[PDB]
Design a binder for this molecule. Structure first.
Ligand SMILES: O=C(c1ccc(O)cc1O)N1CC[C@@H](C(F)(F)F)n2nccc21
Length: 208
């Protein structure tokens, strides 16, 4: 049922760096996750230009931000391309190893953590706020999977039997105790307006 994988060493490093570096500007996590979502939506969109049936799994290309104060989760759902199991395991569809190298090298050359998205590993910025991240994902012609990590060197992948989502990715941020501001409507609004105001898909901030 549940497979446990080791993060590649460089991703493990990246993540402990994100977890362990003092860095107050934690809100960038959301930009980075919306941006990922945006990229996956682009991707399904691009694909659907030559195969519109790729959108049978849901035509609406959107990003939903779903704070849940009870579960202490902020969930970002996109109806993007989704990820195959292979993508999930392979750093959620990124070139995370090399990107981490470039990111480490950028940090050495003056960069700050907010630039994480330039190096294609801004997903891991989730770990600025989330003690655990769960990624539910559904790519066409592949099953729904849940990926999960609380960092510490390993993630899990399992075939997800919960809510079918049609297509896309849902990133569930199990927020750190002290990062509950990211569940506040106005805060989320503020960050989305600050950092994601031009994202080309509708972003719906769900209310509680
Ligand atoms: O499914 C995702 C996805 C991943 C993380 C996230 O936070 C939200 C997402 O929708 N993908 C799809 C695979 C990959 C690709 F599209 F570039 F190939 N990619 N790149 C950024 C986002 C994603």
């Amino acid at each position: 049922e549940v497979e446990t994988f080791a993060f590649q060493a460089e991703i493990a490093q990246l993540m402990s760096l994100i977890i362990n570096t003092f860095y107050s500007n934690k809100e960038i996590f959301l930009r980075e996750l919306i941006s990922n979502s945006s990229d996956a939506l682009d991707k399904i969109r691009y694909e659907s230009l030559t195969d519109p049936s790729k959108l049978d799994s849901g035509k609406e290309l959107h990003i939903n931000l779903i704070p849940n104060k009870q579960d202490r989760t902020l969930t970002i759902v996109d109806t993007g391309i989704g990820m195959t199991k292979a993508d999930l395991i392979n750093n959620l569809g990124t070139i995370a190893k090399s990107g981490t190298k470039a990111f480490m090298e950028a940090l050495q050359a003056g960069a700050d953590i907010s630039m994480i998205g330039q190096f294609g590993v801004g997903f891991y910025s989730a770990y600025l706020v989330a003690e655990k991240v769960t990624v539910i994902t559904k790519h066409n012609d592949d099953e729904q999977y849940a990926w999960e990590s609380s960092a510490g060197g390993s993630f899990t992948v399992r075939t997800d039997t919960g809510e079918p989502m049609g297509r896309g990715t849902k990133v569930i941020l199990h927020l750190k105790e002290d990062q509950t501001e990211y569940l506040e409507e106005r805060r989320i609004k503020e960050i989305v307006k600050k950092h994601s105001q031009f994202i080309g898909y509708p972003i719906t901030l769900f209310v509680e």
